[PDB]
Symmetry: C3
Subunit: 532 residues, 3 copies
Amino acid sequence: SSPPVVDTVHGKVLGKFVSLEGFAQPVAIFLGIPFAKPPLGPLRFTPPQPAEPWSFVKNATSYPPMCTQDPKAGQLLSELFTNRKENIPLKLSEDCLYLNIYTPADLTKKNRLPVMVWIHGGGLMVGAASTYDGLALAAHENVVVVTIQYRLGIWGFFSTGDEHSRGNWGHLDQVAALRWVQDNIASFGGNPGSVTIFGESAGGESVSVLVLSPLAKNLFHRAISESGVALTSVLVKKGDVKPLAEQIAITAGCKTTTSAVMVHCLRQKTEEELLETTLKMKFLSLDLQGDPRESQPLLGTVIDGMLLLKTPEELQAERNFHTVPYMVGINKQEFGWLIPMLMSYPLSEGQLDQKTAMSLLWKSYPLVCIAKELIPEATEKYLGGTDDTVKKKDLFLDLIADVMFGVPSVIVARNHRDAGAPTYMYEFQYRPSFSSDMKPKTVIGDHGDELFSVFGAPFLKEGASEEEIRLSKMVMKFWANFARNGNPNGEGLPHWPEYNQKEGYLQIGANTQAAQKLKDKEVAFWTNLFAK
Amino acid sequence: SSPPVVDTVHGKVLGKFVSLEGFAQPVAIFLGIPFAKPPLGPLRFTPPQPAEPWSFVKNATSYPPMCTQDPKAGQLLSELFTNRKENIPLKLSEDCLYLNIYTPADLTKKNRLPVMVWIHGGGLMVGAASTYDGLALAAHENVVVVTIQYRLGIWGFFSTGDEHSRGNWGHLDQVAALRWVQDNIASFGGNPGSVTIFGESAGGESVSVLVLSPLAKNLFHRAISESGVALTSVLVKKGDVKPLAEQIAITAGCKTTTSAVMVHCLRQKTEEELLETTLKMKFLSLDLQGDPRESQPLLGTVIDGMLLLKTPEELQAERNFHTVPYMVGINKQEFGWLIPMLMSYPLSEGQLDQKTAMSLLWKSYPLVCIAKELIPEATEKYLGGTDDTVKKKDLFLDLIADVMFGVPSVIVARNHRDAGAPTYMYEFQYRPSFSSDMKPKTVIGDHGDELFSVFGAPFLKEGASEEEIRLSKMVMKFWANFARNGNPNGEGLPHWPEYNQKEGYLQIGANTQAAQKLKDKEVAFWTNLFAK
Amino acid sequence: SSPPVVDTVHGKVLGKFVSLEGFAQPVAIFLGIPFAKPPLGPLRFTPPQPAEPWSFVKNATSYPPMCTQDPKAGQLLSELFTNRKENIPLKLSEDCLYLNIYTPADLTKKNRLPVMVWIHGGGLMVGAASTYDGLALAAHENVVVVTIQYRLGIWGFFSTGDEHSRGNWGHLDQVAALRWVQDNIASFGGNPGSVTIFGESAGGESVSVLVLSPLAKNLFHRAISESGVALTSVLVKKGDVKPLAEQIAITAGCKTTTSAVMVHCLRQKTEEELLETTLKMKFLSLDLQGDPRESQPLLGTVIDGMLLLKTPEELQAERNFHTVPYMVGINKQEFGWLIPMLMSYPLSEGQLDQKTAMSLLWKSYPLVCIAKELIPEATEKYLGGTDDTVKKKDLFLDLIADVMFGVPSVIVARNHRDAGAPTYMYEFQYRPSFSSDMKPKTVIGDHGDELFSVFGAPFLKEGASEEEIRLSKMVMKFWANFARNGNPNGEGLPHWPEYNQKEGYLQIGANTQAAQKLKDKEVAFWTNLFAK
Ligand SMILES: C[C@@H](CCC(=O)NCCS(=O)(=O)O)[C@H]1CC[C@H]2[C@@H]3[C@H](O)C[C@H]4C[C@@H](O)CC[C@]4(C)[C@H]3C[C@H](O)[C@]12C
Ligand SMILES: C[C@@H](CCC(=O)NCCS(=O)(=O)O)[C@H]1CC[C@H]2[C@@H]3[C@H](O)C[C@H]4C[C@@H](O)CC[C@]4(C)[C@H]3C[C@H](O)[C@]12C
Ligand SMILES: C[C@@H](CCC(=O)NCCS(=O)(=O)O)[C@H]1CC[C@H]2[C@@H]3[C@H](O)C[C@H]4C[C@@H](O)CC[C@]4(C)[C@H]3C[C@H](O)[C@]12C
Ligand SMILES: C[C@@H](CCC(=O)NCCS(=O)(=O)O)[C@H]1CC[C@H]2[C@@H]3[C@H](O)C[C@H]4C[C@@H](O)CC[C@]4(C)[C@H]3C[C@H](O)[C@]12C
Ligand SMILES: C[C@@H](CCC(=O)NCCS(=O)(=O)O)[C@H]1CC[C@H]2[C@@H]3[C@H](O)C[C@H]4C[C@@H](O)CC[C@]4(C)[C@H]3C[C@H](O)[C@]12C
Ligand SMILES: C[C@@H](CCC(=O)NCCS(=O)(=O)O)[C@H]1CC[C@H]2[C@@H]3[C@H](O)C[C@H]4C[C@@H](O)CC[C@]4(C)[C@H]3C[C@H](O)[C@]12C
Ligand SMILES: CC(=O)N[C@H]1[C@H]([C@H](O)[C@H](O)CO)O[C@@](O)(C(=O)O)C[C@@H]1O
Ligand SMILES: CC(=O)N[C@H]1[C@H]([C@H](O)[C@H](O)CO)O[C@@](O)(C(=O)O)C[C@@H]1O
Ligand SMILES: CC(=O)N[C@H]1[C@H]([C@H](O)[C@H](O)CO)O[C@@](O)(C(=O)O)C[C@@H]1O
Ligand SMILES: *[C@@H]1O[C@H](CO)[C@@H](O)[C@H](O)[C@H]1NC(C)=O
Ligand SMILES: *[C@@H]1O[C@H](CO)[C@@H](O)[C@H](O)[C@H]1NC(C)=O
Ligand SMILES: *[C@H]1O[C@H](CO)[C@@H](O)[C@H](O)[C@H]1NC(C)=O
């Protein structure tokens, strides 16, 4: 009856009860709980700070703003990924360090349900936590779902390569939220002792990162990466970054006399100004002309010396870290449609040839980082198969899909396994009915397609075949089960082999059954082609 | 001789000696002593901070600037209230956290005279400490007089209802000055152990507030409210204030995305800008058209959760607080001329009728907060008396005068009495010869009229009848005596009955004699009319 | 070889090895090591703060920017003083609190060589540490040479005469660097226990200042002032400075309502803006028209109450301070050419007369501070000698040279001697072959001429007569020796008498031999002429 009121370390929070069809216990929902101090003014480009405690009762009943980002791009992605029926239009602001909590527990008791913290993707450029509705998953598997937000673009990843602005602000925000959960989740019926992180795309990469970070140690107990890991090069800036810093500085109208000078000048700029700079830059939009190597696609994770002490590669080559059950998965066709369409890929011809391929792959250097001396050899192994110009276009996509997620994922999984830690893999092959109209019916297992099963899209949206509804129920169980025991298995669900020496993984889809050696041939191949 | 030099915790202060006619020991006067760090830049809308200590000798010989406020309004009020012969023109600035000290002690000794700290009024919108000259009172009753300043308008009362800008900056400034006095007054011959706060209008309201605030506890030992208390609704913002915040924000040219966003944006604005916004808001002028309820008159005290933990009403219903001798007084005709004239009241006809009255009272909602369903009944009890349209105009004034000060004051006094604490009341009925020309000779005991007797106007200005001179001498004695023993009585002065169960109070004026049950009929009445 | 990497309290520093002709052990050189946090934003006009520690290895391999200053003036002086063959063009920035280290030690050992910290001159208006190359001196006398930088002009000396902006930021920066050396120099083979400060012109004045400052106590163990001391009036602002503050404020487009208001407003201004203001002020160029007394030449050292508790004069009249070996020297013709040419002195006629002299001396009031009632008498003692209009021009120069450096220096030296501390004086008379072309061959011992011998110019530049090369070798020995034992003497070098009661000093030049009572006649004279 009376709105739910929970007590947190910083003050009381007022939520709202929401009931899902066919469920007695209604879910308590809190929207916009702050987990850090608004990173405004001098706090820009600095680690997130603890939030100021409030004097009375804070109403967590309005969706928090999304971090500053390209408004069009953001709203668009929010629509294509949202698991709720009506997409919620959001506001933009630097004041976005909020998290949304969804608890199916009976607050009037001492419940200690498992917690699943979701890290939205968006290439570390755009995205939001309000996009994902935890209602379904919260109710169906009886787990507390938390959707966190973190600084994006410049605001969360600007780096000068030195102590004046190390960088990785966004990841720090992520860590911060995790501590908030440790220190508060208990009041929402969650068990701080069983926290599970999971995300997709950049969000999945972030999970991979936190699993390597000394800082994260002890903030979670199970991890899941969906279509995205740390070895996913494009998102990790290796090498001297100072140049990009100076570039951003200039475009923003700042001098570059010294690092300190740049950061200071940027701290002066208004959000609006920095947003225009973010636009001027043309990022995700894949540049075709000019020099492919000079084309800088973004500014993500970096080896700051705090969150990460060294490249992911070097890091995983060691087993001197707290290892936890890690689930690493990918989708049948990562580069099926969503991604290419969003970057404005020239493949709007529905066909390609060996010559136009090498050219395209080369201009794709910022997304695949392949030397132009290997391109021919790589193009050969994938396209030299058939003569059907259409098959080549599809093979070309698989090419990129393997370099960006395919191989990285498996490599990560193997290392984790070898480090002596529970590892699990999967390949989601299914075409959700919620797919966009502009998406061809032949694209199955496209980027983010799993999102709908994981977040129970069939129980919030409309017209889900019984098949889809069942698929979703199955995935949530696996996920939730993992979050519970660090093992997806359970009664009623197909057997999911652990990723050990036999390299078994689960193929999720219409026919969900186990398999082995995922992308084994590919990994083996690319590894050599990269050894030059 | 040699200018007076006193040592304070933050450094040496140089003053000036001023002799009053017929007094051997000249008074040492220090003007512009800082008691907090200039609330500039990022310090705006934040609690006042300790002042930076100075290296040599600071000359306290120039009147400090008055906090930013409507310059016309301010200078005008300064003239109508000033107790000195020539009104001193002041400067405006955000740097106004200063206090003026007036000590009749012989600094070359260890004097420990009682202290009286004066809080000027001005509706929390305008005012200044330099307006009041302590010379007379200081010399005549041998007490150290201190005139403090505190942030006004937006600068001192802007609030978003949450931790991003709780509010009550002004009251915090007031508390701050009080601590300064505890930590330093000893060096000017004052006794930190016997500090008495007193003020009028908003300043009187502030005294009432500090008497309820946990923060004030132990900073004073006697209190006096002249024509103004905490129950004086107009000055206390109860309810969700967020709306006014957003309104101010907009007028100032700021977004309203979140609270944090508003405060930050306002911190950017220049003083000039915020002053224009203050003007645009048309703060004091009473709006007649539009919806009377929508008309927002100001932005004063709020229930921040720091200075005040709950509404004054709720607070005084409890006796779990440090109680001190409290003197609560009012004047015969609070709404006689001063106030109406300053708000531009439509009563420039010298007469009114039952119908035009209810209309006027309704538009006066922001100043009386009376439901339009009671207005008729209220108008009846006061105006239904005679038919003389002129008498009604005068009765209408008394109506407001009772709701704004009359009843509140008495109720406050009663609660204080019942809380088991020395309580004293008075009703000042006299027409000072210093009254403005535009003030009719039939208005006696108008708002602020007591100010002239209290600050010894007859000994600084010119042409005071012996009667006025004597009246003043009498009031100062009562006041000073209270400041000394928490009891006005003393030899040579009429007997002042304590406000106990018989409800005795003192009628000050040409014929000063005791009386009983002040505004008893009214209180009783209004209480019911308000119980709907 | 592997670049030199040293560990400091704030992190690892990477340098570069540089070998000098005919020296086995190459010198390790580190350029741009930060010793304080960039004084940007709110840190402007505030004491320097500790630097932020870095996570990996900081490459100290690029010349740090020079503090904001008149670019033309700066580059010009850098050329005329530089001891290296090719003048290094620098960048301007508020981020300039860096120091350059030059160590001839074998970092692979526990070396503890003496340290010599150089404070460049430039009237506290311009200058840089990168101008002086320590390579030679470092190698030749086996001492660790450090060249520090400190805030200049407005940025480092703006003062309001009160706690809102005491001033002497620049000197504080200097002190700060010295603490850095105490806390870190050990890692570069230096001995924190044997630090020697030395500078020229304003830099020399600064040395004189640190020797009187309580703050400096224990940061050095030997001091050297070249052509510049604390009594050098022009550089020390005595009296109420508030006026200059308000002037600067106005020119910068700020109000002057209060001190706090001025400082705040100035903190807002951009570097560019303040640089334009610095230019508008026409600071170093000597004004001829208008009132000579009103002409304000600069804004240097002030009696802040922190760095300096009272005027140098009063201070040295006391012997209650830590006294160390102090070397005070001057050059034959301080006002020979460099200075006059740089202020745009009207003496471009190559001759003058008794009448035009008094007029010039008077307009020179901001540089000599002589009353117009003494000018005639002063002009007489120096010019009344011969009739040769040319001799007068030369005598006129000596006149100023004695008031600005000559007498002050000796007076300082005497006091130091009398305070019971090792004192040494010298008079450098030589014309370096590196002199500018526009410098007449008859000018010997011009301002800054010693700089070339001290920094080993003959070993870095080209075409040095064997005579010059030997002179330089000799000076470096004396200097280094002093830095070692607080006594210049040693085998192979002429005997340098200590400045005791006989007042012996060393005449350095082609024929280096001792002498006595330097400028004795002059001091005696001027002292009386000044006693009015
Ligand atoms: C954020 C998404 C697209 C947003 C877009 O805005 N639509 C297009 C143009 S818009 O002007 O306004 O119309 C996604 C879609 C595909 C994603 C990219 C690819 O999938 C490649 C990945 C590889 C990852 O591991 C790292 C991120 C990344 C290098 C990507 C960055 C980012 O998350 C992208 C680009
Ligand atoms: C972005 C859209 C273009 C809208 C535009 O107006 N053009 C329409 C027709 S044409 O192009 O100009 O010929 C879509 C509409 C249909 C899409 C194409 C077809 O649906 C065929 C697919 C096959 C996919 O698996 C790969 C992309 C793709 C090879 C396409 C590239 C692209 O996303 C297109 C061209
Ligand atoms: C400061 C004075 C006037 C301010 C004014 O702006 N002048 C008028 C027009 S101006 O364009 O430029 O000329 C005083 C005079 C009468 C005062 C008001 C009334 O007396 C009513 C009181 C009731 C109090 O308890 C609280 C303050 C208050 C609600 C007032 C706020 C304030 O102190 C006022 C308005
Ligand atoms: C603000 C002033 C108006 C100046 C204006 O130019 N009008 C002048 C004459 S008229 O109005 O237009 O009829 C003053 C001057 C005289 C004042 C009036 C009279 O003095 C009568 C008083 C009686 C008071 O106790 C109440 C206000 C009041 C009923 C008045 C309202 C108001 O303050 C007036 C009208
Ligand atoms: C830095 C030099 C000149 C600066 C100058 O600005 N150049 C000139 C004109 S500009 O664009 O070409 O316009 C030197 C040359 C002579 C120096 C001055 C004189 O030698 C007098 C000395 C006395 C010292 O003990 C203190 C510094 C000082 C009071 C000087 C300050 C400064 O170092 C000066 C002025
Ligand atoms: C600043 C220079 C002027 C360049 C200008 O174009 N004038 C050239 C010839 S004239 O002036 O116009 O007569 C130099 C060039 C030669 C210099 C002059 C001569 O060399 C004579 C010297 C003697 C010095 O010891 C004192 C300065 C000085 C008495 C000079 C003042 C000044 O620095 C001058 C005049
Ligand atoms: C500021 C605003 O208008 N939005 C609502 C906020 C939001 O939670 C946060 O702004 C983002 O979620 O929550 C409140 O209840 C609160 O914090 O007291 C106030 C308001 O109702
Ligand atoms: C106008 C003004 O008030 N500022 C004055 C301040 C005051 O000390 C404080 O403001 C408090 O009076 O400092 C002076 O008096 C002073 O030390 O010479 C001069 C200055 O004009
Ligand atoms: C952009 C630039 O060239 N500056 C250099 C700075 C300097 O340390 C400071 O500017 C002081 O010289 O930082 C480095 O040296 C470093 O720490 O690795 C790299 C860089 O080359
Ligand atoms: C206070 O002392 C300062 C410092 O000299 C001086 O400027 C000021 O005029 C003095 N105050 C007055 C006005 O007497
Ligand atoms: C640091 O300096 C070394 C040697 O000059 C160089 O190899 C390296 O690239 C530099 N690193 C940085 C931070 O640029
Ligand atoms: C927040 O929303 C709740 C509804 O649950 C409401 O009662 C409350 O008043 C709101 N906050 C305020 C005080 O405005």
